[PDB]
Design a protein around this ligand. Structure first.
Ligand SMILES: *[C@@H]1O[C@H](CO)[C@@H](O)[C@H](O)[C@H]1NC(C)=O
Ligand SMILES: *[C@@H]1O[C@H](CO)[C@@H](O)[C@H](O)[C@H]1NC(C)=O
Lengths: 40, 40
């Protein structure tokens, strides 16, 4: 029985969900318009 | 002696030079400007 993964105050699965220990990396990609007047 | 290739009236090397029998193919390549106002 894998009842170890629950959201109970006293469990280590609730500790990972309240505070995520692993960082999240987000890379913002943009688009640069080269011919702006020609689109008009 | 390869005196056969001369420009004498009576030779077949002068016939190739007066009138070139082999066609010449020329392909004209152009450049099209995509962002003309942005160069200005
Ligand atoms: C979790 O830990 C104890 C358990 O009773 C409690 O005192 C504490 O307030 C709880 N935390 C939250 C956010 O409920
Ligand atoms: C070549 O051929 C004869 C050779 O005498 C002559 O009548 C003719 O005029 C010559 N052609 C030219 C362009 O000189």
């Amino acid at each position: 029985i894998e009842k170890k993964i629950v959201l109970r105050n006293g469990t280590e699965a609730f500790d990972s969900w309240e505070k995520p220990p692993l960082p999240v990396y987000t890379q913002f990609y943009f688009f640069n318009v080269t011919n702006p007047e020609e689109i008009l």
